[PDB]
């Protein structure tokens, strides 16, 4: 299942600038299914994997790589989203040229890095369409009060983890739309807001409490937020 001997690296697609110059959607297309089965077959399962050690979350890349190379996308999706939250957006925004795809042993030998981010995007795409995703709601709710400040990625991930534990989470933010700067800071040109809306609705479905359009500086303060919960998280 090495593959990289005779095959060649090929990106999903790229729309030419003749018509790309005017739209605001993404310039990359979904990965073809047979292209997915071929490109996944490109890694060599390098012992002591450098691909993982540089990915700041250090998810299990070669495992789902092998899986996608052979199939069983449900098992691969499960083992992918186990240790990484928000994979759909992380695999799309993070600069893999220096984080994960910038140190694969295939690239270091000048052969051409295996497209890791594209396979991450693909495996997170088809998994959601057929609906192999359920909100991680807890059982036997512990019972306490916890709150976060700022709906950014850090706050959202913290809230997801705490709701999976079984606390009562409260999200505060200044903006009217939730999701940190993914809906206001990052341009839609590089990331469609549809997937962020989908993920944030999934998060809300788990039992997360929202408090949109709030400020800790004027409307409230630190003693108030501290007394209102057990502990307060600051992701401003």
């Amino acid at each position: 299942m090495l593959g990289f001997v005779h095959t060649a690296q090929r990106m999903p697609d790229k729309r030419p600038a003749a018509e790309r110059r005017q739209d605001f959607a993404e310039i990359y297309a979904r990965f073809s299914d047979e292209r997915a089965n071929e490109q996944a077959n490109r890694c060599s399962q390098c012992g002591v994997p450098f691909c993982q050690v540089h990915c700041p979350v250090s998810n299990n890349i070669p495992d789902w790589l092998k899986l996608t190379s052979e199939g069983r996308l449900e098992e691969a999706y499960e083992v992918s989203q186990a240790t990484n939250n928000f994979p759909e957006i992380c695999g799309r925004i993070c600069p893999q040229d220096r984080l994960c795809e910038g140190n694969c042993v295939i690239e270091q030998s000048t052969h051409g890095a295996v497209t890791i981010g594209s396979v991450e995007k693909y495996i997170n795409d088809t998994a959601w369409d057929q609906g192999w995703v359920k909100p991680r709601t807890p059982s036997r709710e512990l019972g306490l009060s916890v709150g976060v400040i700022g709906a950014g990625p850090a706050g959202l991930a913290a809230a997801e983890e705490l709701r999976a534990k079984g606390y009562e989470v409260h999200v505060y933010d200044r903006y009217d739309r939730m999701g940190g700067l993914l809906v206001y800071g990052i341009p839609g040109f590089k990331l469609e807001k549809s997937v962020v809306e989908r993920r944030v609705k999934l998060l809300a479905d788990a039992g997360v409490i929202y408090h949109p359009n709030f400020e800790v500086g004027r409307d409230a303060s630190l003693p108030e937020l501290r007394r209102k919960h057990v502990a307060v998280l600051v992701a401003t």
Binding site: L2, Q45, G47, V48, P49, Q52, V53
Partner: protein, 1468 residues
């Protein structure tokens, strides 16, 4: 070293037998080790009959009237330094003899001459005396001997009751006498002058010359024993002792009587293996059987499923296999009862045996053939002993018995076929009964309780289900040892598999499966002295591994005889719950076995959230040891159902502990769960289970063969393992005899580990197993030795020359938490620091490191050349490896580049060995085993071997090459000494070096190799790398090099032999701290190896075997080789950095060179962790210091060791006209069997002068008269001719390269040419080119590993042309058994006369047919014509005469891979 025997066929005693025995012992001085003192020896012995006339004359001179019936003589060794102990021994023996009403005549002091014994052996000399006993009761002589034997036993017991040391009864009997001692071989007749009277006469005489292994002697342990004279070793000495201790409780026979109670512990304490063999042999013989019967019942013949053997012999083999466990091992036995005299071999037939029959009714057998002087006009037949065969002489009727007729006479006695059919085998019983399932959540919970991964589980198990072979690793181990591993680990990781290195060579399970058997018996244990039909009434299973169905069949067959025992302990129990559970199960098992039930089955199915599972290893060990100590194991079979075992090592360690059958069920349910989702494709579950069982069988066979044991019944319960990190009391109470050199965790730690794992498994709600990080690195856990950051740091530091970066590297490496033993040692001193300038120069340190060998087949030629260039540039010694070397590299380049290799290897393959390849060196190295694959030898994949590799190794392109595990020319330490003699003969200026692997019990091996005139020892660690090897062999084989190094240094300076060797090590030497600590422990040189590879470009991808290394180090394809990045300067920078780091450490310590620190072990201390909860590992036995005395701790001598000169000197003086003018020379000489390596130094001289193909064939011609010694014409280059009249000993033509050797019986010989053995075993080992026209039969393993040579012989032994690769072989006559095993190249022509070839030949990878094309017929005719022209063989001429009808008589054999590569198809 060697045995021998002489017997009179008719049976009339005479002086000639004893005289010939003395003469034979006078000419075995060249096999045994040579001492420079000229006095000391290993111990010799002779065994003859009692000369009644001499003793009658003696007692008559004393005054008594000589009685008319037979007398009896008893030889005793009493203490000498004291006086009171002598009186005690004398009164003991006198009262014990006079307790039986016998009559005692008197004592006798033996005159000796003690001036010839050395001063080391004279210190422990016992007072030797004899006692004379008559017979006043007039009883028969059989009862006389039996009473004498009982008296001897009771005397031994009584004197053991008083702790009177150094007392030994040699032989108390009325028929035989034994003269043995610790002198030399020749000087025997000058120490015992009693053998110089013309009155001594005997019809049989046995003699032995042993080969000691330690400089310290011991008189009571010299051959021959009271009933035996054995040569060789014993692989199964623990299992047999344990099983005999089990059998002791039910041995009763009316032949003994009440005194039977005195003979309970038959196997005494503190005796050698052969001693135990002798004592059990005598105990069985005194019961009533005949000597051939017990010999066949102790060392049986290898039962094969063929049709060459009749059915009576088959029934006999089945009976003897069902009676008693075998005793495997290389053994050449020459045993004698009072009536029979038998001589035979073991199952495998390793050690040779050759005999001669004279017209005077005299048979002479021995290890060599030219020992005694016999005229050619007196012999009738010369024969040899094959596998398991035996030759006997009956003295009463005065008859001779060869193999077939003796076996028939033995089968004549009892109706075996009326008893063997009383057995039962579970194939139809399970098949007929078979034709008459768990939740994934609970499965995951149980797997998490036992801690099985997900990635690795389906990585090592998947090839077993899909393909049926265990997975193949790619690089060395670096995971920490078990005791320091943070995460949970099973019990099986704490056990390392043993393996024999030199003292007994392994057996190749891939090519010799015929002597391999996995049969097991249930309900066969009974009285060992009784014979009846009831014995062979049992259940027989073809494989000890059982699935669920077979287990249900066996259990519901046993019915009510079974008794289950729960193997779980309460989780809520206190700190001592585990010990209480152990005691509970022991008591339950004892009571159950007492309660009539005769079968015990361990089970842990009740595992759940309330009770935890007892480890299976500990449970079965406790149960088996308790049953042995309670004398109840002989009534009950033991079965275990484990829920953890997945790989072959677990089953191996579960069987070795003492189990019989196991059914690891959880593997089966996991496999079924995998198959139900459709992952294995279209394979039905039946095929999956079949492949799983087959893979487990093959793996277990491999682990057994790794130490030379071919029978499962003797390996069971032997305890052949090693514990590294268990408490001493634990393994000494609840485990069989196994040594743990360092103490480890006791009971509390194990209970804590199992409890924490159980809690993290059940008490939570898990979903999926962890990713697992055992075999490959993952971010979860399981810390390794080489991670990403450290690799990048080393590479950047070596490519940028920034020594500060290398210091940062070293700090990063040393900062990691403990992972090896060498991370638990601190170093301190007492003197003041010394500035770094005073430390010796860097170059004097860099010239010490070496680069271990790496086969050219493993890694691409670019890396090999780069390493060679760099190392030869800095001045050190690089290494070549097993794959040979290209000749075009034997000269320096134009740019001052030296691409040659300075150290050459002589491995077990002998692939590229050549007379020219052995002179382009400075030091030769001998390979025994390495740290990754200590038993199975190096292997090379199929798609790796290119055309260049085929040219280097003289082989066929694109074929799987696997090297034979055992050195076919090293079957004993004497073979090692002979091989070192050979190597030092062929190269007049190089050094020799052995290569061992660190394991327990290496001290005796160290002393032996030091006595074998070696130069440099090499202790290789257990974490070395490799090109390819099985995974289990990588993970669980070997021991840390600190243990081996400390043991070797201690045992080698204790014997005052340190000033003649140079110790060198490698394995996991990453930074300078490790090098300094190793130098302190006793090292003198250092090998880096794998680290250097990473400096060259490797990034530890662990895909060496897949031919797809992305960097381009280990690949043979052309494209990937372009991706190389190495440079000869990076290795230079790495070695410079290492040297500077060692310099800094030494300067900070307070010394000025490594010479002042080697052996100064007192500098070290052991620190430990406080809250680690680990029971402290006592490292003191490794830090113990023994004082060498006057000799320095590192003392050495310049130049290689000396060696006596052979005939070759006398040859190279007379041949001076050739070396000075190139004129033809023809010589003749008389060669005795003592002269070794005939015609080798001349080969070296003529290679250095002219070359290999420099002379025309037949330039120098030599003729020899008599019998040539072993290894005749080793490495005979083209241009030399050697014609010897007589016979050769063995190894003739070893490594032949272009020469021409011819043997023949002399013209005065009245024998038939094609019915008499003329050459010995393993002829033409690794031959490359030349011709060999022989006239006579050949020994065992004929033309093994032959590649290129042209050989014509008349007959052969078993396993002929084993692993053949090239050349032509023409056998005229009967072939042995299992002919053409694993043949891959060349072609063979066998002379058929009885159409019996298909019964014998092996059709694995070869095809046989009739001769078809006239071209090959003409070539065969040319070969036969040349053979006739050379030796004038009459039978060859008679074959030639009838060509028209003899053309269609032969059979042609060709490999299955040379068919389509042929230039002219053999088939029309």
């Amino acid at each position: 070293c060697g045995v021998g025997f002489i017997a009179a066929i008719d049976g009339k005693p005479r002086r000639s037998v004893v005289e010939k025995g003395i003469e034979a012992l006078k000419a075995v001085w060249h096999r045994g080790a040579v001492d420079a003192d000229g006095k000391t020896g290993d111990g010799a012995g002779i065994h003859v009959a009692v000369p009644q006339k001499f003793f009658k004359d003696h007692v008559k001179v004393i005054g008594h009237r000589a009685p008319d019936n037979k007398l009896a003589v008893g030889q005793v060794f009493l203490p000498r330094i004291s006086l009171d102990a002598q009186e005690a021994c004398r009164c003991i023996v006198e009262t014990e003899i006079l307790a039986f009403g016998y009559y005692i005549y008197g004592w006798r002091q033996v005159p000796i001459n003690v001036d010839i014994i050395g001063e080391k052996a004279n210190a422990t000399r016992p007072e030797i005396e004899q006692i004379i006993v008559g017979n006043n009761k007039g009883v028969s002589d059989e009862q006389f001997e039996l009473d004498l034997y009982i008296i001897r036993r009771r005397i031994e017991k009584a004197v053991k009751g008083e702790q009177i040391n150094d007392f030994y009864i040699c032989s108390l009997s009325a028929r035989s006498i034994i003269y043995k001692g610790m002198f030399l071989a020749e000087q025997l007749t000058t120490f015992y002058p009693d053998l110089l009277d013309e009155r001594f006469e005997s019809d049989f005489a046995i003699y032995h010359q042993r080969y000691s292994t330690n400089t310290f002697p011991t008189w009571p342990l010299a051959q021959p024993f009271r009933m035996l004279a054995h040569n060789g070793e014993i692989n199964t000495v623990k299992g047999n002792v344990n099983w005999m201790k089990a059998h002791e409780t039910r041995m009763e026979h009316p032949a003994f009587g009440t005194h039977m109670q005195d003979l309970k512990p038959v196997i005494g304490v503190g005796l050698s293996d052969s001693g135990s063999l002798d004592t059990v042999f005598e105990v069985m013989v005194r019961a009533g059987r005949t000597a051939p019967m017990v010999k066949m019942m102790l060392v049986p013949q290898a039962l094969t499923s063929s049709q060459t053997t009749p059915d009576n012999h088959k029934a006999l083999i089945q009976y003897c296999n069902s009676v008693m466990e075998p005793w495997d091992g290389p053994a050449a036995l020459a045993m004698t009862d009072g009536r029979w005299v038998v001589g035979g071999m073991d199952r495998n037939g390793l050690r040779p045996m050759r005999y001669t029959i004279t017209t005077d009714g005299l048979i002479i057998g021995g290890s060599e053939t030219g020992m005694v002087k016999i005229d050619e006009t007196q012999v009738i037949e010369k024969g040899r002993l094959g596998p398991g065969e035996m030759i006997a002489v009956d003295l009463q009727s005065g008859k001779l018995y060869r193999d077939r007729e003796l076996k028939d006479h033995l089968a004549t006695l009892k109706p075996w076929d009326k008893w063997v059919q009383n057995t039962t085998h579970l194939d139809e019983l399970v098949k007929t009964a078979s034709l008459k399932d768990m939740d994934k959540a609970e499965l995951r919970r149980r797997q998490q309780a036992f801690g099985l991964t997900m990635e690795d589980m389906e990585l090592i198990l998947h090839p077993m289900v899909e393909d049926g072979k265990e997975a193949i690793g790619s690089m060395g181990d670096d995971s920490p040892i078990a005791v320091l591993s943070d995460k949970y680990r099973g019990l099986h990781h704490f056990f390392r598999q043993n393996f024999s290195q030199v003292t007994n060579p392994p057996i190749d399970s891939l090519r010799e499966r015929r002597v391999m058997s996995l049969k097991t018996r249930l309900g066969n244990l009974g009285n060992i002295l009784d014979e009846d039909e009831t014995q062979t009434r049992l259940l027989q299973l073809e494989s000890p591994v059982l699935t669920t169905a077979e287990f249900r069949a066996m259990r519901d067959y046993m019915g009510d005889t079974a008794a289950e025992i729960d193997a779980t302990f309460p989780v809520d129990g206190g700190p001592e719950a585990l010990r209480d559970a152990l005691r509970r199960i022991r008591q339950e098992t004892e009571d159950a076995v007492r309660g009539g039930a005769t079968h015990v089955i361990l089970t842990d199915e009740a595992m759940g959230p309330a009770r935890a599972a007892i480890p299976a290893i500990l449970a079965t060990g406790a149960v088996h040891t308790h049953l042995i100590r309670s004398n109840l194991r002989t009534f009950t079979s033991l079965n275990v159902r484990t829920a953890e075992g997945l790989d072959t090592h677990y089953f191996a360690v579960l069987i070795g502990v003492g189990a019989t059958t196991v059914n690891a069920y959880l593997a089966q349910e996991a496999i079924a769960e995998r198959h139900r989702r459709g992952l294995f494709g279209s394979m039905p579950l039946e095929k999956g289970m079949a492949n799983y069982k087959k893979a487990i069988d093959d793996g277990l066979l491999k682990i057994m063969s790794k130490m030379g044991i071919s029978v499962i019944s003797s390996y069971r319960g032997g305890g052949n393992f090693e514990a590294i990190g268990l408490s001493r009391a634990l393994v000494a109470e609840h485990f069989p005899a196994m040594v743990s050199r360092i103490s480890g965790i006791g009971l509390n730690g194990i209970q804590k580990k199992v409890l924490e794992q159980h809690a993290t498994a059940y008490n939570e709600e898990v979903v999926a197993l962890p990713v697992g990080g055992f075999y490959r690195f993952r971010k979860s856990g399981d810390r390794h030795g080489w991670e990403g950051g450290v690799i990048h740091t080393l590479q950047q530091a070596v490519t940028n020359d920034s020594y500060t970066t290398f210091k940062k590297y070293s700090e990063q490496v040393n900062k990691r938490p403990p992972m090896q033993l060498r991370d638990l040692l601190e170093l301190r001193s007492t003197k003041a620091p010394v500035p770094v300038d005073e430390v010796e120069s860097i170059t004097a340190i860099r010239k010490r490191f070496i680069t271990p060998g790496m086969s050219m087949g493993a890694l691409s030629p670019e890396a090999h050349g780069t390493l060679n260039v760099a190392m030869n540039r800095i001045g050190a010694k690089s290494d070549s490896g097993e794959g040979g070397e290209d000749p075009a590299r034997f000269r320096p380049d134009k740019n001052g580049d030296n691409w040659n290799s300075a150290i050459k290897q002589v491995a077990s393959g002998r692939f590229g060995v050549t007379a020219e390849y052995l002179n382009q060196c400075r030091e030769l190295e001998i390979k025994v085993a390495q740290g990754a694959k200590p038993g199975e030898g190096g292997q090379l994949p199929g798609f790796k071997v290119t055309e260049m590799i085929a040219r280097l190794r003289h082989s066929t392109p694109g074929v799987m090459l696997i090297s034979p595990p055992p050195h076919h020319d090293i079957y004993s330490i004497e073979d090692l000494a002979q091989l070192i003699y050979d190597l030092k003969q062929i190269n007049p200026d190089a050094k020799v070096t052995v290569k061992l692997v660190s394991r327990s019990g290496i001290g005796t091996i160290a002393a032996g190799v030091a006595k074998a005139n070696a130069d440099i020892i090499l202790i290789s660690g257990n974490s070395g790398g490799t090109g390819a090897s099985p995974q289990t062999s990588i993970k669980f084989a070997g021991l840390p090099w600190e243990m081996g190094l400390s043991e070797v240094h201690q045992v080698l300076t204790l014997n005052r032999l340190r000033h003649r060797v140079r110790l060198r090590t490698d394995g996991g030497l990453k930074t300078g701290r490790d090098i300094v600590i190793a130098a302190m422990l006793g090292a003198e040189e250092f090998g880096i190896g794998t680290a250097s590879l990473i400096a060259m470009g490797c990034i530890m991808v662990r895909q060496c075997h897949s031919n797809t290394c992305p960097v381009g180090v280990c690949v043979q394809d052309d494209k990937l080789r372009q991706k190389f990045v190495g440079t000869p300067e990076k290795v230079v920078n790495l070695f410079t950095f290492l040297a500077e780091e060692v310099r800094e450490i030494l300067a900070g310590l307070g010394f000025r060179s490594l010479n002042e620190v080697i052996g100064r072990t007192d500098l070290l201390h052991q620190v430990s962790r406080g809250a680690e909860h680990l029971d402290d590992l006592d490292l003191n036995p490794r830090l113990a210091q023994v004082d060498p005395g006057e000799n320095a701790r590192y003392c050495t001598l310049q130049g290689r060791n000396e060696v006596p000169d052979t005939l070759d000197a006398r040859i190279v003086a007379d041949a001076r006209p050739l070396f000075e003018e190139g004129e033809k020379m023809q010589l003749a000489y008389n060669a005795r069997n003592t002269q070794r390596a005939i015609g080798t130094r001349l080969s070296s001289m003529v290679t250095r002068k002219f070359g290999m193909f420099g002379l025309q064939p037949g330039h120098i011609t030599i003729r020899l008269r008599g019998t040539a010694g072993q290894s005749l014409g080793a490495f005979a280059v083209q241009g030399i001719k050697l014609e010897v009249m007589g016979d050769a000993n063995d190894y003739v033509g070893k490594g032949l390269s272009g020469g021409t050797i011819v043997v023949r019986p002399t013209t005065s010989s009245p024998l038939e040419t094609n019915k008499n053995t003329i050459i010995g075993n393993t002829v033409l080992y690794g031959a490359t080119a030349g011709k060999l026209f022989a006239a006579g039969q050949a020994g065992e393993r004929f033309a093994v590993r032959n590649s290129g040579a042209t050989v014509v012989v008349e007959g052969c032994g078993s396993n002929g042309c084993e692993y053949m690769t090239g050349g032509t072989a023409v056998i005229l006559g009967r072939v042995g058994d299992n002919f053409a095993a694993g043949m891959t190249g060349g072609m063979a022509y066998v002379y058929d006369l009885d159409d019996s070839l298909p019964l014998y030949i092996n059709d694995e990878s070869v095809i046989f047919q009739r001769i078809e094309v006239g071209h090959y017929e003409s070539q065969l005719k040319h070969l036969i014509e040349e053979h006739v022209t050379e030796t004038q063989s009459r039978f060859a001429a008679e074959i030639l005469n009838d060509w028209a009808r003899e053309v269609t008589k032969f059979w042609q054999v060709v490999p299955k891979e040379m068919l389509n590569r042929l230039e002219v198809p053999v088939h029309l």
